Ligand binder design. Structure first.
Ligand SMILES: *O[P@@]1(=O)OC[C@H]2O[C@@H](n3cnc4c(N)ncnc43)[C@H](O)[C@@H]2OP(=O)(O)OC[C@H]2O[C@@H](n3ccc(=O)[nH]c3=O)[C@H](O1)[C@@H]2O
Lengths: 181, 182
C-alpha cells in the first residue's frame, strides 16, 4: 500500500490501542494528578511543517512540564515487558486582573512522523521532500480514520494538526478551547 | 512505496539505530552480565508464518529468562524519556555425560512483524492473508539491506528468520551455532 499506512497502523496497534483504554486508570492511580487532569484524554500533536518534535514548554511561558504519570507495563510484545509513561503539562492562562486559570493536559507528539523525517533527510533517501510531505498528509488522514472507527478509543483522544515550527505557542490556546466545550 | 518499506525504516530509525550503539555500553554496566554475555550483539527474530510470538522459554527447556540489562533512557520526540531495556536469556546446552555449557544471548522479536499480523487479523483489514505474507517477505529483505549498509550497526546484530509456529525450539540451536562461528 503506502508508507504512511504502516506507520499509522503501527502507531495504533503498538501504542494507542494499548494506552488509551488504560489512560483513565493511570490518572486515577496517581494521587498527585487524579484531581488535576480533568480532560482524561491524550492530545496528539500532528506537526506538518517541522518534525523535530521540540518540547512545547520551551515555546510558551504558560506551558510548563510538571512531571510524569506513574509508569505501566504493557504485556503486548515478545518475551519482553515494555513500560510506558505519560508526561503532564501545566497550562496557566493569565488574565489582565492578575488572576489565573490552571489546567493540566496529557500532550504528546505523533512519533511516527519523526520517522518520516528521518527517511528523507539522510543521503540515499527512501523518500524525497515532496514524496515525504504526501505521506505526512496520508498519515494524518489515516490515523483519523483508524481512531474514528476504534470503539475502545472513542472519547479518549484529540488530534491537533499544526505546523510544528514557529507556532508551538498555539498549543496552549487550543488545549483550553477543547477543554471548555 | 510499500507498507513493509515504512515499517523497516521506522524499526531502524526508531529503535535499532538507537539501541545498537548503546548495546556494547549497556552490557558492560551490568555487573551480573558483563562477563556472562560474550556475544555483544542483538539477535532479531523474524517470524515468517506464525506471528503469535508467545514466549521463547516456554517452547524450550534449554532456554530461560534470567533478567534484564540496565535500561536506557532516550528522548524520542518528546519531553519524557522512553525506556529501552533488553532481556537476557539463559541457554544451557546439555551433554550425555551430565555436563553442560551455558550461554547468554540477547534475543527479541522484530516488533513490526506483529503489527503486520495485527493489520490483517481484525475485521475491515487493509491487508489480506496474501498481501500480509508478501509484506512480511519484503520487510525481511528491506531490514537486511538497511542494516547491511549501516555503519552504526555493523557487528551489533544478527537476523534469524524462521517459521515461528513450532520452530521456537530451533532458536537455541541457531544462537549457539552463531556463537561457535565467532
Ligand atoms: O513498540 P512499537 O510497537 O511502537 C510503535 C510506535 O508506537 C509509538 N509508541 C510506542 N510506545 C510508545 C511510548 N511508550 N511512548 C511514546 N510512543 C510510543 C511509537 O511511535 C512507536 O514507533 P517508534 O518511532 O517509536 O519506533 C519504531 C519502531 O521500533 C519499535 N520499537 C520501539 C521501541 C522499543 O523498545 N522496541 C521496538 O520494537 C516500534 O514498535 C516501532 O515499530
Amino acid at each position: 500500500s503506502n508508507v504512511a499506512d504502516g506507520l499509522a497502523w503501527s502507531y495504533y496497534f503498538g501504542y494507542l490501542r494499548l494506552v488509551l483504554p488504560r489512560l483513565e486508570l493511570r490518572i486515577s492511580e496517581s494521587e498527585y494528578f487524579r484531581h488535576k487532569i480533568t480532560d482524561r484524554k491524550l492530545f496528539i500533536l500532528l506537526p506538518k511543517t517541522c518534525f523535530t518534535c521540540d518540547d512545547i514548554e520551551q515555546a510558551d511561558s504558560r506551558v510548563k512540564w510538571v512531571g510524569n504519570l506513574p509508569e505501566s507495563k504493557i504485556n503486548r510484545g515478545g518475551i519482553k515487558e515494555r513500560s510506558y509513561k505519560h508526561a503532564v503539562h501545566e497550562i496557566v492562562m493569565p488574565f489582565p486582573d492578575g488572576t489565573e486559570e490552571k489546567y493540566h493536559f496529557i500532550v504528546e507528539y505523533a512519533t511516527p512522523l519523526m520517522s518520516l523525517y528521518d527517511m528523507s533527510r539522510f543521503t540515499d533517501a527512501q523518500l524525497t521532500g515532496s514524496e515525504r510531505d504526501h505521506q505526512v498528509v496520508l498519515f494524518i488522514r489515516k490515523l483519523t480514520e483508524i481512531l474514528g472507527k476504534s470503539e475502545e478509543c472513542k472519547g479518549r483522544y484529540e488530534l491537533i494538526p499544526f505546523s510544528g515550527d514557529e507556532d508551538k505557542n498555539k498549543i496552549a490556546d487550543i488545549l483550553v478551547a477543547l477543554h471548555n466545550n
